[PDB]
Amino acid sequence: GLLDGKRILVSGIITDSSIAFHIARVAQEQGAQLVLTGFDRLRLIQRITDRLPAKAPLLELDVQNEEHLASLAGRVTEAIGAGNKLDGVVHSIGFMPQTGMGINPFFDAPYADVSKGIHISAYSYASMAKALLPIMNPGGSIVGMDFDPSRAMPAYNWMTVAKSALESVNRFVAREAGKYGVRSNLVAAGPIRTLAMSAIVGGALGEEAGAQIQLLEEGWDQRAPIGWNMKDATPVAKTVCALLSDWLPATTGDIIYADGGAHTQLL
Amino acid sequence: GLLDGKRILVSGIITDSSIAFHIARVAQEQGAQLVLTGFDRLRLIQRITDRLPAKAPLLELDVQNEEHLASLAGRVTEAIGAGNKLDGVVHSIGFMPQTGMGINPFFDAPYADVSKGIHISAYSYASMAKALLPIMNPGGSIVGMDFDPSRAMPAYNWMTVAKSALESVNRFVAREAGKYGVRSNLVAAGPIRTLAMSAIVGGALGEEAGAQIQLLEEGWDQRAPIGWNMKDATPVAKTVCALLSDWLPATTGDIIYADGGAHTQLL
Amino acid sequence: GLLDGKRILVSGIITDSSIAFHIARVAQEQGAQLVLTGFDRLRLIQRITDRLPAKAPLLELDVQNEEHLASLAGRVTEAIGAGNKLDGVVHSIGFMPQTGMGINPFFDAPYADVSKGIHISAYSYASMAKALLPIMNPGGSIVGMDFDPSRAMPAYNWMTVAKSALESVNRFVAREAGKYGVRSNLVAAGPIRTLAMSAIVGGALGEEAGAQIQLLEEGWDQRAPIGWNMKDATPVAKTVCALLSDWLPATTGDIIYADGGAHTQLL
Amino acid sequence: GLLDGKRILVSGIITDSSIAFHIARVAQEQGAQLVLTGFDRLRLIQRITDRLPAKAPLLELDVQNEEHLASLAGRVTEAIGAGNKLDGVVHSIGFMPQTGMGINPFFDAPYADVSKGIHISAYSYASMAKALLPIMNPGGSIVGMDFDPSRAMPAYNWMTVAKSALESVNRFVAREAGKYGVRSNLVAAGPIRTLAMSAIVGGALGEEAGAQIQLLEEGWDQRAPIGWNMKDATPVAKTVCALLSDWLPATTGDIIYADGGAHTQLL
Ligand SMILES: NC(=O)c1ccc[n+]([C@@H]2O[C@H](COP(=O)([O-])OP(=O)(O)OC[C@H]3O[C@@H](n4cnc5c(N)ncnc54)[C@H](O)[C@@H]3O)[C@@H](O)[C@H]2O)c1
Ligand SMILES: NC(=O)c1ccc[n+]([C@@H]2O[C@H](COP(=O)([O-])OP(=O)(O)OC[C@H]3O[C@@H](n4cnc5c(N)ncnc54)[C@H](O)[C@@H]3O)[C@@H](O)[C@H]2O)c1
Ligand SMILES: NC(=O)c1ccc[n+]([C@@H]2O[C@H](COP(=O)([O-])OP(=O)(O)OC[C@H]3O[C@@H](n4cnc5c(N)ncnc54)[C@H](O)[C@@H]3O)[C@@H](O)[C@H]2O)c1
């Protein structure tokens, strides 16, 4: 298997449609031994991850909780055994209050809300690296999930701004992680029809926002030279596993686009 | 003059070495009528701006103060006269707590501090646009100051992240400003030896940070095909005035590099 | 006027819809004294440029002709008078054989044809700089016309490749031009409905190619936060004049987007 | 093995220091069955490739020879057996006449020489795709070698321009290759001390050119957060194999940076 013998921490599972769920599944299919982290609804997350191919300990991690972050390495070590370290870390965490997305006007989002989104979606990539680098092996790999923010788009609003911040954080995390012989990269995925995204398309954050996302999805598959299936997270999960493997050893501070090639085409 | 008859708001003057001071001077030399905004030390700022070629009303604006922002358009209107609107707005505002820059480790900056920096340096570009767009004329221009954050660099740390966020905010502000017939752009300047920058080089945020910035400056002038003089803000001020003028009417959501061409050269 | 007293060479006029025609008109309105260069049909070009606001000498220049390039500086000097030099040069030249564009398959373009297109559209920017830099004043400006090639698009095919090459040539020309105190930049324009472009939309290079360009144009105005009028070259001409002026003195090796802001927006 | 059962064509071997030699070695270590192509010195190339872990047929291919390209698919089919197709193609071909590189002035390179370099280094990526796509399996992968040309640099001169053209060609090739279910990507490698590169450093294309490349190499390892070893092609070869594998299935028209992360860091 691609990840045989690797110990990998995967954050961000909340439903069976979470990108992290598919990352975890593919990593286990490829021989990785996982530790999972979940936010707030741990009973739910345990029941969800019961469906993964193999057993994996679940640890609580709210990335806005300083105590959780300060205890995290020790809790991971307890889970994988003293004297063992991680080979991989997956950050698949994102959040923006509803004022910061959808039809809610861009100018009307209070900074308190934007700040909460940037905390969870961008600063926490650095928070997790700080917490886990001391228990990572040389040759290891930190991977985060990104959505290409280099151009503005409808409805994504401040979440786009948070992703622009994350891309910058990643380049700095790479400097720190390099001291440990560890790589840091993001995977910029195309749109994936998770539960929350389906709810948005259905109008949860306003009708015109749903309409705009639907147009965005359609354009994506049209632009993608090999097409793009928003209902299939597996290609994205495979790409994360590629970055976790030994096969991209000279790539760091970087962004790998798992988007069907859409970002390379104007139309 | 390039800006004859234009009413322009300029924020960000705090010393005679502020980039905004030079923007204001050049804009006045080119016929613009200014309104100035200053943060906290208004007596100081008034004494500083007494040295500008012409009189300009000074208004208080702390961009973290919701009341200041809510009253700003009315205060500007009072200063320029009912029935008059602005043709231009200059955002020359930036701040990051010392934990977020210098030799202070990247991972050690508390989010409260980073958030304060992002508030002032990135979110406030949107805050000011929200406040002022309703009193801007079609054909008008909003300009912000940027430092190219597309690559990580030593010591700049979270301020780089804030600039990455600002570049994203600018692209969204352009969408809103377009509804008013108004352009929004950033000027990415090379390093300018302001008071604070000279203090950093002198070691105020740690010795190795000062050393690294000094190396950065030297490399900049070396890379720049037409050279780069860190002691001369005038080229930057001229570029801001170009964007405030009628001569770049089809440019918005964009970044103009006033950096000697350094970002186009590897070495 | 913005360009009062400046001596500027403008290449690329062939019809009254040429972008160069509008560049020349605006530059003359702003006080510039022009020298024009034309390819092959000089009687036609003279009759066309009779419609410009002021008289300007016309010189023959085929950029594939080594003798024309070797004699060009002396012929310009004769036209502007011994002891006078140019302050500006405008390259508004492009060509790709029909095999290299339209519905003709990308893989079917013979290299001889592609090479001819790259010669005229990219290498000639360096050819002209070589020829003219020795008779340019410090503070001068070389400007070329570009169409953003960072993403592939239908029908533009090898012309896109030639523009990618031109952007690279520009960054090297900036290194050479810097030795003379001269700037070199491109203006990346949105689509402009010139004679040839109208013919393409009308199906001259195949029906589906025309259809695709029409979709491209429509999308452009939709994406542009301030809109985009393909029938109006004046905004582009103004931008070229901005670069020819003294108001962007620290920009070189760079690309200024005169495209309504469309390239900053995904949709 | 990562590439078990895959039939892959590898071009560009000329010495045991060729990047293609290391690509071929790693691909064979991972179970790939190779077909090799060589230019001009086939006796030499056969003796060189005798050192690879396994036997691989060698075919002649001069990419400037239309007859070679027209016969190539049939010759490959003969080598791998009727009814078998390729899963992968590696383009590791580049050339620029000495007038187009080194201390020879940028402006002094004759177009005939530049054109020859662009033919071999950029157009041939499309030539090979045209030739081989009809005998490639769905899920297949075309990979080319790139050196990041987004910024100008000393001495690389017109080869940089050719790489800018190649990056554009790759985005179009991806459109064509998509019709076959095939991906097309480039790997942008850091500097590798091949025979020719060592000769350049030693002064073969002028003293100052050698000096500049040496400075470039040193800066590269300094900037790279995980370092960069110019004497080790294996990380680059592994990255090519990653792209040839099934593990990056949603990436096309793109560029993967195998450069130690140097391009993500300013200093
Ligand atoms: N869905 C897409 O279209 C798409 C596209 C590109 C990238 N991404 C990114 O992929 C990642 C995963 O998103 P997803 O689409 O799988 O949605 P998701 O809702 O399944 O995952 C988001 C995760 O963030 C977690 N989270 C929120 N607040 C947290 C906190 N305080 N502490 C810890 N975890 C917290 C949630 O519990 C959840 O597990 C995010 O970074 C998202 O931005 C998503
Ligand atoms: N100096 C450089 O090298 C350089 C390079 C590129 C860009 N820039 C940018 O140019 C802009 C101006 O910086 P500068 O170098 O002139 O330094 P400066 O210190 O003179 O200006 C920063 C300004 O921000 C103001 N400010 C801080 N907190 C504020 C608040 N709460 N509300 C309102 N204003 C507030 C300060 O009062 C000051 O006037 C900043 O955006 C900076 O990031 C500077
Ligand atoms: N029209 C658009 O949509 C558009 C958009 C962006 C950029 N541009 C660029 O603007 C420039 C001008 O194009 P245009 O649209 O005005 O079309 P145009 O046909 O009016 O101009 C092209 C010019 O190139 C000249 N030319 C061709 N071969 C030549 C040679 N051998 N020597 C000298 N001159 C030669 C032609 O005579 C003509 O004057 C080109 O670089 C084009 O790529 C055009």
Ligand SMILES: NC(=O)c1ccc[n+]([C@@H]2O[C@H](COP(=O)([O-])OP(=O)(O)OC[C@H]3O[C@@H](n4cnc5c(N)ncnc54)[C@H](O)[C@@H]3O)[C@@H](O)[C@H]2O)c1
């Ligand atoms: N060496 C580096 O520092 C470096 C860095 C990044 C990318 N690259 C790229 O990697 C690729 C391989 O270069 P390399 O460094 O291994 O050098 P190399 O000399 O070993 O390989 C270049 C190959 O191109 C072949 N070639 C030249 N003309 C040809 C023609 N007419 N038809 C077919 N093949 C022809 C040569 O025979 C040789 O096999 C090139 O694209 C190069 O630009 C090299």
Ligand SMILES: Cc1ccc(Cl)cc1NC(=O)[C@H]1CC(=O)N(C2CCCCC2)C1
């Ligand atoms: C592309 C786009 C446009 C507009 C809107 Cl409202 C949403 C999207 N898409 C998304 O929000 C996709 C991408 C993204 O970061 N998430 C996050 C998932 C976790 C909660 C915050 C949002 C889901």
Ligand SMILES: Cc1ccc(Cl)cc1NC(=O)[C@H]1CC(=O)N(C2CCCCC2)C1
């Ligand atoms: C380029 C660099 C590297 C490292 C450090 Cl510590 C500082 C700099 N440079 C600066 O901080 C320059 C650029 C910049 O945004 N400012 C801001 C000026 C206002 C207060 C916060 C910083 C001044």
Ligand SMILES: Cc1ccc(Cl)cc1NC(=O)[C@H]1CC(=O)N(C2CCCCC2)C1
């Ligand atoms: C954007 C696009 C797509 C497809 C096609 Cl066929 C044409 C265009 N557009 C153009 O060709 C525009 C842009 C451009 O470089 N020219 C050139 C004008 C001079 C002759 C060669 C083409 C005109």
Ligand SMILES: Cc1ccc(Cl)cc1NC(=O)[C@H]1CC(=O)N(C2CCCCC2)C1
């Ligand atoms: C980075 C740099 C700067 C200056 C010079 Cl002279 C050479 C280099 N480096 C190279 O030429 C490296 C990168 C590259 O494309 N090749 C090619 C190898 C095949 C023959 C043509 C050049 C080798």
